[PDB]
């Protein structure tokens, strides 16, 4: 897994075979996992393009990773979606998982559509941000933002 | 590439904010109010770079999530520290050596 | 004489295919097709002795599972990694000592 380093306010990357002793790790607090929303990358934040980026897939188990820090989203998505028979496309939110804390706009989309699969993944591969918990799959009735996570080392004390 | 130079981040400081008085669960804050706000700006290299790095990390991280059978992986951050220490300290540390960090 | 010299193993992939496009879960393979296969053979000692290690390890491992209240413990291997560093660098490291890994 790639690891970025910050020395005197400019991030350089430290490759794994390479070894720098000058770099200092004092504590675990220095290390951090951060989610970043897609809004920053200039992708379209409107609903029609967003519903197009997401897609359903089966045979693939869900995976969850934690991120301590996250970014304020101008756009947040909450999903309630059912089929013509009334069955639910997305699973109920598991325990310990909550919606995105900071959302300027929460778009609610409710309509019927074909469920072709058991779970929902991002086609581009972006994680769905939640409260400090990133999932590759969408959950019902939970505000989320589209984003990706990185791990960095902070030189807080020298 | 369109990059947002302004970084407005919400997070939960560990010792950052050891204010106290909220540990007690009855009177502790609600899930919505626990978070703290911060802003990093006036830097073109770091903010743009952070967005990029997460973007590249998604690959190795995805292969990692698929590989591990745990539904939720919180042990990702700790492994890097282990590798960091093992890379220097794990081998026999020879004084005045390339892998070893000892200086007289 | 009951040992199976041959070893046909199914396993996970760490860095096998770091091509950069199967990591996405949507176009990624199903849970069933992700595993890799490998074979180790024509070695009597290496193969037969190992079934033996796991077989004996089961003993020490069980008491640990009983001891830990965690329903699922993924940290055993990693704890062992912790212990490795602790046995050597945990205590004052003396040059040319029996415990310390330091050579002039």
């Amino acid at each position, epitope marked *: 897994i*790639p*690891l*970025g380093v910050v020395h005197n306010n400019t991030l350089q*990357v*430290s*490759d794994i*075979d390479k070894l720098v002793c000058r770099d200092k790790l004092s504590s675990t607090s220095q290390l951090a996992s951060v989610g970043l929303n897609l809004e920053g990358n200039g992708v379209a934040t409107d609903v029609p393009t967003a519903t197009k980026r997401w897609g359903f897939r089966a045979g693939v188990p869900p995976k969850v990773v934690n991120y301590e820090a996250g970014e304020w989203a101008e756009n947040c998505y909450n999903l309630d979606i059912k089929k013509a028979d009334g069955s639910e496309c997305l699973p109920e939110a598991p325990e310990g998982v909550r919606g995105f804390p900071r959302c300027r706009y929460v778009h609610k989309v409710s309509g019927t559509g074909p469920c072709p699969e058991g779970y929902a993944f991002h086609k581009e591969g972006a994680f769905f941000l939640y409260d400090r918990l990133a999932s590759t799959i969408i959950y019902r009735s939970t505000t989320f933002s589209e984003g990706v996570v990185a791990f960095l080392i902070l030189p807080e004390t020298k | *590439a369109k990059c947002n130079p302004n970084l407005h981040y919400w997070t939960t400081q560990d010792e950052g904010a050891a204010i106290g008085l909220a540990w007690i669960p009855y009177f502790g804050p609600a899930a919505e109010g626990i978070y703290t706000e911060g802003i990093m700006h006036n830097q073109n290299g770091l903010i743009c*770079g952070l967005r*990029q*790095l997460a*973007n*590249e*990390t998604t*690959q*190795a991280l995805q292969l990692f999530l698929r590989a591990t059978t745990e539904l939720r992986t919180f042990s990702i951050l700790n492994r890097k520290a282990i590798d960091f220490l093992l890379q220097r300290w794990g081998g026999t540390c020879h004084i005045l050596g390339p892998d070893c960090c000892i200086e007289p | 004489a009951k040992c199976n010299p041959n070893l046909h193993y199914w396993t996970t992939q760490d860095e096998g*295919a*770091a*091509i*950069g*496009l*199967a990591w996405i879960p949507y*176009f990624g393979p199903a849970a069933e097709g992700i595993y890799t296969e490998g074979i180790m053979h024509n070695q009597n000692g290496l193969i037969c002795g190992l079934r033996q290690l796991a077989n004996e390890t089961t003993q020490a491992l069980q008491l640990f599972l009983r001891a830990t209240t965690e329903l699922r413990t993924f940290s055993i291997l990693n704890r062992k990694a912790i212990d490795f560093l602790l046995q050597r660098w945990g205590g004052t490291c003396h040059i040319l000592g029996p415990d310390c890994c330091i050579e002039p």
Partner: antibody, heavy 121, light 107 residues
Framework: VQLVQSGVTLVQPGGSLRVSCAAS????????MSWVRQAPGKGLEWVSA????????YYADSVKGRFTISRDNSKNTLYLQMNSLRAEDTAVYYC???????????????WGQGALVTVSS | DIVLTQSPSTLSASVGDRVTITCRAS??????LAWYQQKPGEAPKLLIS???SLESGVPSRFSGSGSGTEFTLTISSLQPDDFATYYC????????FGGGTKVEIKR
């Protein structure tokens, strides 16, 4: 938006050689670079890749042992340090840049002219 | 791992002829595919990406199609600059190149 490989090079078995791919006319660090070798009368073969940032390096099964790829975003330069060379590794090496994806994928639009490396000894 | 294959290795054609090369992968790599062009002694040149989207600066006559396991490169009209070796690449797995289809005018 032009790339410049090494002009001419000659080596021996198990020898060490550096191929330098200069990049200019467009932003470097933004994109991820890779090497591709072409043996005479043979199809192209993927050699090594490095992330746009440089944190992740990737090598092929055949070459993972004896090759090393590295980059400097400041000099806008890509170095391929080649060690333990073999006769099979004798080829024209091309250094390319990404077609559409930004440090996400390994597409190639613009190719270098190629750098000749001969291990015949 | 995964290796793709080409049907015409050498295809005898003439100027302005509709030309179709068929490249079928062993596994199903969906829509992720690319086509290249290499003239003798010249660096490989990008023809098409994602099998649907065309690169800029590229002549409009060339087109590509197919999904999953099947793919087809079609040229409605052939030109003097089209006689070079053509390969197919899939990014789903190990970066891999096809045998190549060389174009000739030995009618």
């Amino acid at each position: 938006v032009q790339l410049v490989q090494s002009g001419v090079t000659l080596v021996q078995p198990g020898g060490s050689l550096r191929v330098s791919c200069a990049a200019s006319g467009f932003t470097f660090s933004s994109y991820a670079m890779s090497w591709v070798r072409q043996a005479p009368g043979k199809g192209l073969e993927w050699v090594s890749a490095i992330s746009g940032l440089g944190g992740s390096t990737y090598y092929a099964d055949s070459v993972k042992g004896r090759f090393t790829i590295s980059r400097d975003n400041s000099k806008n330069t890509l170095y391929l340090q080649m060690n333990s060379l073999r006769a099979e590794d004798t080829a024209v090496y091309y250094c390319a840049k990404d077609h559409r994806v930004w440090a996400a994928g390994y597409h190639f639009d613009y190719w270098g002219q190629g750098a000749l490396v001969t291990v015949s000894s | 791992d995964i290796v793709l294959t080409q049907s015409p290795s050498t295809l005898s054609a003439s100027v302005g002829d509709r030309v179709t090369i068929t490249c079928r992968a062993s596994q199903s790599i969906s829509s992720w595919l690319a086509w290249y062009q290499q003239k003798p002694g010249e660096a490989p040149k990008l023809l098409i990406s994602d099998a649907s989207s065309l690169e800029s600066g590229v002549p409009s006559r060339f087109s590509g199609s197919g999904s999953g396991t099947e793919f087809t490169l079609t040229i409605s009209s052939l030109q003097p600059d089209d006689f070079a070796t053509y390969y197919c690449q899939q990014y789903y797995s190990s970066p891999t190149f096809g045998g190549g289809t060389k174009v000739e005018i030995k009618r």
